[PDB]
Amino acid sequence: TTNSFLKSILIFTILISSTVLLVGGYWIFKEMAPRPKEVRSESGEVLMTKETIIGGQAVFQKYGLMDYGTVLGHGSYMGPDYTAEALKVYTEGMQDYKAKADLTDDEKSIIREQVIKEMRKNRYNPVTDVLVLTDAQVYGLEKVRDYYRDVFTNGDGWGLKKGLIKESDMPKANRAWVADSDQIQQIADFFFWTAWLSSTLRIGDEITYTNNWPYYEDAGNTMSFSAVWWSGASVTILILFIGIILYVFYRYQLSMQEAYAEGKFPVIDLRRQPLTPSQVKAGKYFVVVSALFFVQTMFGALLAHYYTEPDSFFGINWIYDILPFNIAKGYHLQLAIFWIATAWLGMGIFIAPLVGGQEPKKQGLLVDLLFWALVVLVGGSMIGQWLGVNGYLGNEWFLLGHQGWEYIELGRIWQIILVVGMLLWLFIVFRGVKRGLKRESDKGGLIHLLFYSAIAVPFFYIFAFFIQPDTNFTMADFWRWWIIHLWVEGIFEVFAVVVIGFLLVQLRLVTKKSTVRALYFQFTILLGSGVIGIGHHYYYNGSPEVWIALGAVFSALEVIPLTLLILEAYEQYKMMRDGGANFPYKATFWFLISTAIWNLVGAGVFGFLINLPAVSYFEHGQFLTPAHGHAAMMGVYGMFAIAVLLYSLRNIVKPEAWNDKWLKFSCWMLNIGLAGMVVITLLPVGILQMKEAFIHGYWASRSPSFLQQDVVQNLLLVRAVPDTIFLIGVVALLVFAIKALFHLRKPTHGEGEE
Numbered sequence: 001t002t003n004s005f006l007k008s009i010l011i012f013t014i015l016i017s018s019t020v021l022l023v024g025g026y027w028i029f030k031e032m033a034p035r036p037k038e039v040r041s042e043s044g045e046v047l048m049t050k051e052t053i054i055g056g057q058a059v060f061q062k063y064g065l066m067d068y069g070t071v072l073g074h075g076s077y078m079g080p081d082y083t084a085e086a087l088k089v090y091t092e093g094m095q096d097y098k099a100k101a102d103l104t105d106d107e108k109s110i111i112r113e114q115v116i117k118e119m120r121k122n123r124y125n126p127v128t129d130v131l132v133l134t135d136a137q138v139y140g141l142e143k144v145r146d147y148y149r150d151v152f153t154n155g156d157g158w159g160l161k162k163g164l165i166k167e168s169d170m171p172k173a174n175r176a177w178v179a180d181s182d183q184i185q186q187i188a189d190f191f192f193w194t195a196w197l198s199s200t201l202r203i204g205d206e207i208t209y210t211n212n213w214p215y216y217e218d219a220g221n222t223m224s225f226s227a228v229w230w231s232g233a234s235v236t237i238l239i240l241f242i243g244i245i246l247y248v249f250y251r252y253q254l255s256m257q258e259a260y261a262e263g264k265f266p267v268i269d270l271r272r273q274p275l276t277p278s279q280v281k282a283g284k285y286f287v288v289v290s291a292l293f294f295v296q297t298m299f300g301a302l303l304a305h306y307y308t309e310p311d312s313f314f315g316i317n318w319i320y321d322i323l324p325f326n327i328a329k330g331y332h333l334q335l336a337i338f339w340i341a342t343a344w345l346g347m348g349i350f351i352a353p354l355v356g357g358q359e360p361k362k363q364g365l366l367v368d369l370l371f372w373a374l375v376v377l378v379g380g381s382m383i384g385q386w387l388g389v390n391g392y393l394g395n396e397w398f399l400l401g402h403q404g405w406e407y408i409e410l411g412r413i414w415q416i417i418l419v420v421g422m423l424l425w426l427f428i429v430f431r432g433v434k435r436g437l438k439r440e441s442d443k444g445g446l447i448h449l450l451f452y453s454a455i456a457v458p459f460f461y462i463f464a465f466f467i468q469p470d471t472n473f474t475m476a477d478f479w480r481w482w483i484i485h486l487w488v489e490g491i492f493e494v495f496a497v498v499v500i501g502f503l504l505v506q507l508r509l510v511t512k513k514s515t516v517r518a519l520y521f522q523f524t525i526l527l528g529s530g531v532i533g534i535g536h537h538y539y540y541n542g543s544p545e546v547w548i549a550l551g552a553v554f555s556a557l558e559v560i561p562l563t564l565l566i567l568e569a570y571e572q573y574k575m576m577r578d579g580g581a582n583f584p585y586k587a588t589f590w591f592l593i594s595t596a597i598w599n600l601v602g603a604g605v606f607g608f609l610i611n612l613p614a615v616s617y618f619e620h621g622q623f624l625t626p627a628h629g630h631a632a633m634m635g636v637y638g639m640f641a642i643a644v645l646l647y648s649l650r651n652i653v654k655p656e657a658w659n660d661k662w663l664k665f666s667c668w669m670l671n672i673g674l675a676g677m678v679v680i681t682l683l684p685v686g687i688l689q690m691k692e693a694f695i696h697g698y699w700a701s702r703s704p705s706f707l708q709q710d711v712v713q714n715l716l717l718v719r720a721v722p723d724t725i726f727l728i729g730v731v732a733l734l735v736f737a738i739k740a741l742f743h744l745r746k747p748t749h750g751e752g753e754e
């Protein structure tokens, strides 16, 4: 019964939090805005069907528009937010209809006020899944319908391709998820629907299905009381637990303890370290991630360029033709997760034999096979996205094309081969680790924790399958975040962490006992806040008001584990010094330390800059989000992968040929460039965009007009300095990875014994 209480706590934490999430998941499904079987006029004339709405949404995914603009604040920022934009048109129309832009202020005042009292009342009948909307609203639906036909035909005057939507892209009829009916009327319908629930009061409630989001006076959308109250409450509860956790942390010494006495640093003779065929094979895995990292960055350079030159890349042509923003965005996200995730799977391959004590038979075979599996998935899924968005696919867009969800752009059959790949991966890890699990008595020991977390990798991605074209937007978004917020960060904040504890225990730098207890404490506070904290993504995506409290409170608690960082980085810096200038893992620790500092600054402070429900009300779906997004994603996960990537490359390259000079340069260039693009561009544009929404309405902050202001453009233009500096850091890494295969060692032991 070694760490019994810590186990009860962790298990209980996981149990309780998982329930809350599921309960809240249920309340969403049950309280999200409805999609009526028929929405119609005062004459009883049907204009919309649950099937239309599902289709509009479907073509929106079909054409990967979520990698261009947003809906309900989620998606890309090059384009606008269709919910807020469609809501304005629909509202403007209602004004004109009742206006029968020339009226007096005393006059436009009256009408405005009239459309307010009329549009915010819920006219949906729960008893009968049908919604009826006044004429003033139908006239509005018209303007919305016309508006987007012009848009998806003529373009949006900013980055969007002309007449991108065309029937010829899909069969006469019997179209996959989109309905038998003009496609660009389904879209206008989908957009209108989101715009409908965003401005219509929930039944019995006093605020809308999105808690009065987006901000927009003309529609009566203003900040809710919950948004302000929970901003204060969430922080006070955080202040309360920081104290409590700090005390628990201090009283139980819940951190790693050095395993060596003063001056007694352990010897690290990498030259006489068993090496196996599967490890050296996992070595080339890293040069590819290093390469995917290179291309991923480039697409980023491209996206940033498009804010300054919308439809061209320095005059050239094919570029905006074959590689437009939405498509480039998708790859940027897809490759980010791909190279970072993949870096840790490789790390898993690499340490697997070490945990077991030998090379599993056919390991190299399986490893090599897993290799060409992802390489296919990557090259393949990307090809699919191109064909899918472009229309050179039929009803195979969902299965092989672009699924239409930011962060989840690959097609389902592509997702299937993904899980199998991970499943295989899992098998490979298990084969090599298996015997370790057998020698390890304590079922909650290091190796068991390493194995339990490793399995969450493939398993947890399965929740993505609860998502498909006809799912209600809010409910599908609910599950999407399980992958973005729980999965991606489950791959890195749990698996990676236990993998490092293992590495530090192996190098004999920290006591094993000390380490597993530490992991327990981290996992409980990490899952104790993060699981429910997922909710801050549900403030305004249409989920019930309950998530504003739940999300605000638990995401704020996520900061707690983060402050026990700047000081963990120091303990690491410290032992890095305890090892002289001949310390083999210098580069690894420099990236390790950085991961930690960016965790406090990128996720901690920049993430919190936009966490308050009162702030998010205006900020949600704006430049500060990417500001935080980079500081956190690249600052934390990227650096971490790189730390581990270099750790392996060190156990594979012949020492004599190694030189961490170039790595110091990369580390400096990566860190400075990241901070530079966040501070010099993303941050200041974010403030302007939030200010712009506060004074004119969120629609104004999301119009291309905002991106066109000179001030915005200059801010946007100077991003090239730090983006280049970042780019330089990544090529140095690439160049070090590539010309590293030229100095590799060869396996010491085969299916032998270490």
Ligand SMILES: CCCCCCCC/C=C/CCCCCCCC(=O)O[C@H](COC(=O)CCCCCCCCCCC)COP(=O)(O)OCCN
Pocket: 573, 589, 590, 591, 593, 594, 597, 598, 601, 664, 667, 668, 671, 672, 675, 678, 679
């Ligand atoms: C919006 C603001 C966001 C700010 C984000 C800040 C991120 C902070 C990043 C820190 C990187 C830490 C890297 C390891 C530091 C500890 C080990 C170390 O530095 O050893 C150094 C060389 O380090 C190295 O060679 C490692 C490379 C150090 C390069 C740091 C550049 C970071 C600049 C951040 C501010 C723009 C040896 O030289 P010394 O000056 O004696 O070391 C002591 C200074 N730490």
Ligand SMILES: CCCCCCCC/C=C\CCCCCCCC(=O)O[C@H](COC(=O)CCCCCCCCCCC)COP(=O)(O)OCCN
Pocket: 001, 002, 003, 004, 007, 010, 011, 014, 017, 018, 021, 441, 442, 443, 444, 445, 449, 452, 453, 455, 456, 459, 494, 523, 527, 531
């Ligand atoms: C909504 C979802 C939210 C996220 C939830 C998943 C999070 C995944 C990430 C990390 C999970 C780490 C879980 C560690 C739990 C350890 C509990 C534990 O080991 O208790 C042990 C028995 O465990 C046992 O006998 C085995 C039970 C514990 C492991 C079971 C498999 C768990 C797999 C989870 C991933 C799919 C108590 O007895 P022991 O000390 O092991 O045995 C005697 C030792 N002298």
Ligand code: HEM
Pocket: 067, 075, 076, 077, 078, 296, 297, 298, 299, 300, 301, 302, 303, 304, 305, 329, 332, 333, 336, 337, 340, 625, 626, 629, 630, 633, 634, 638, 723, 724, 726, 727
């Ligand atoms: C030369 C460096 C880079 C540049 C110029 C760059 C540029 C961009 C641009 C322009 C966007 C557009 C978001 C939008 O409008 O929808 C973006 C998004 C994003 N980038 Fe990068 N990027 C770079 C490096 C990275 C790296 C190294 C990572 C981490 C692996 C990363 C992760 C992301 C993520 C997660 C998003 C989506 C965030 C959001 O939509 O709010 N980027 N990037």
Ligand code: HEM
Pocket: 073, 074, 075, 406, 489, 536, 537, 555, 556, 558, 559, 599, 603, 604, 607, 608, 609, 610, 611, 616, 619, 620, 621, 622, 625, 626, 628, 629, 630, 632, 633, 636, 637
């Ligand atoms: C290393 C950990 C973290 C990573 C990698 C991360 C990453 C990201 C990314 C990539 C996005 C953009 C999602 C999108 O494209 O729509 C995002 C959004 C967000 N993050 Fe984090 N995050 C982390 C930690 C945190 C923490 C600790 C907080 C709490 C203060 C937080 C609060 C938010 C909020 C509120 C948004 C929503 C922005 C909006 O709706 O406009 N994050 N995060």
Ligand SMILES: CCCCCCCCO[C@@H]1O[C@H](CO)[C@@H](O)[C@H](O)[C@H]1O
Pocket: 005, 006, 009, 248, 251, 252, 253, 521, 524, 525
């Ligand atoms: C979320 C915070 C969980 C904290 C769990 C603390 C569990 C402490 O557990 C205690 O640790 C002591 C050593 O420090 C041991 O001597 C005790 O026998 C043991 O019960």
Ligand SMILES: CCCCCCCCO[C@@H]1O[C@H](CO)[C@@H](O)[C@H](O)[C@H]1O
Pocket: 027, 028, 031, 544, 546, 549, 550, 553
């Ligand atoms: C600090 C966190 C406080 C959380 C309080 C959650 C209160 C949930 O309250 C419940 O919300 C449901 C809708 O989601 C309603 O259908 C239920 O009738 C209501 O009791």
Ligand SMILES: CCCCCCCCO[C@@H]1O[C@H](CO)[C@@H](O)[C@H](O)[C@H]1O
Pocket: 731, 734, 735, 738, 739, 740, 742
């Ligand atoms: C993105 C650009 C990556 C460039 C990688 C260049 C790697 C050069 O690599 C070097 O090539 C020499 C032959 O030319 C060999 O003799 C060296 O052993 C090899 O390390």
Ligand SMILES: CCCCCCCc1cc(O)c2ccccc2[n+]1[O-]
Pocket: 298, 299, 300, 301, 302, 304, 305, 306, 308, 716, 717, 718, 719, 720, 723, 724
């Ligand atoms: C293959 C596409 C390579 C991209 C080349 C463009 C270089 C480049 C890189 C950037 O990071 C920029 C940031 C802001 C504005 C412009 C930028 N430009 O032009």
Ligand SMILES: [Ca+2]
Pocket: 074, 075, 076, 406
């Ligand atoms: Ca986004």
Ligand SMILES: [Zn+2]
Pocket: 485, 533, 534, 536, 537
């Ligand atoms: Zn989150």
